[PDB]
Symmetry: C3
Subunit: 124 residues, 3 copies
């Protein structure tokens, strides 16, 4: 079944997929931000979605931004989350990093996971 | 399908918990008291060992509350065959000292499904 | 079917798993590098791969290097990537970090993923 998503405002851009072999789906900033060196900023996408079962969405770095010193903080979108997906951009570069509305900021990867029951034992 | 067995190596260990039925993984807690200066990192002991599930690894993943305070996760690959005590590398990239108290939630362990292909060298792909 | 790989030069080393229960395949530097503190470097492995289906390769940290302050930037090797696999090593230690040709620098994890359809809705 398809993954449903909602645009909170008209400023949101629907996540995009360019090729059959891409790991993920492009995420875009819904707002203008400026991030000083050595600081981080939560970037709102204005996109909420119903994640697939036995999966989480990993907010993953674009390589081009990573080479510029821009890293991703947090980034775990659980299947229970119905809120605004936020990208924590960390400016580990030396200059101010500017984020404009519509800028590609990360890629969302639907990562397959397991939910085992945990059982405490005396020894393994 | 079958349960993942785990051991509390001391009485200070807290059983990893599911936050909600659709949470990504299992919350880990500090078994000891630490102070992490700004621009430093610390291996935080959980005193938890597990018999990890097959064809997965445990990713030590950040909780966003800590990430927004500048606390990031180093390392974080828990191999399927690892039988030792699980450690969480907390990196204080914030401006102030970060305090970790015994029992504090520090990360979420995600059982990520993986593939072990055979690798074969070729002249051309 | 096995993952086919090519050595771009004879400086490349074949990725291997340490043990039958290891999450990742060892990646090695094909060249010498020097990384200043608070900087990063794209490290060439000189290995290219025909990546497996419904997977991406995550460039993941080795714990020893992580404890020394060396972190991984970027790290998403898409299914469709047929180029030289690069490792972005970030030196978050306090001293200059030396990379010698042949050094183990990271691990590649073949992470299982989904490529779902996306559908915009009014409400989740
Ligand atoms: O980088 C992130 C990390 C998390 N979340 C969402 C998903 C979670 O359900 C919620 C709370 O995150 P935690 O504090 O529980 O990690 O925020 C984001 O939007 N961006
Ligand atoms: O953040 C980490 C990283 C690794 N390990 C443990 C689990 C791994 O299987 C093992 C890897 O050890 P080395 O092979 O790097 O020595 O260490 C942790 O507890 N926490
Ligand atoms: O750490 C990294 C991140 C990416 N890549 C490769 C694989 C990706 O498919 C490609 C990304 O290229 P762009 O689409 O971002 O230009 O680069 C690496 O070799 N190492
Ligand atoms: Cl991951």
């Amino acid at each position: 079944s398809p993954v449903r998503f909602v645009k909170e405002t008209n400023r949101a851009k629907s996540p995009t997929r360019q090729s059959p072999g891409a790991a993920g789906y492009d995420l875009y900033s819904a707002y203008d931000y400026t991030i000083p060196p050595g600081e981080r900023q939560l970037i709102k996408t204005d996109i909420s979605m119903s994640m697939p079962k036995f999966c989480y969405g990993r907010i993953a770095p674009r390589s081009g931004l990573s080479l510029k010193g821009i890293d991703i903080g947090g980034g775990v979108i659980d299947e229970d989350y119905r809120g605004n997906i936020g990208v924590i951009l960390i400016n580990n570069g030396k200059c101010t990093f500017n984020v404009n509305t519509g800028d590609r900021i990360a890629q969302l990867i639907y990562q397959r996971i397991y939910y085992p029951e945990l059982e405490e034992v005396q020894s393994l």
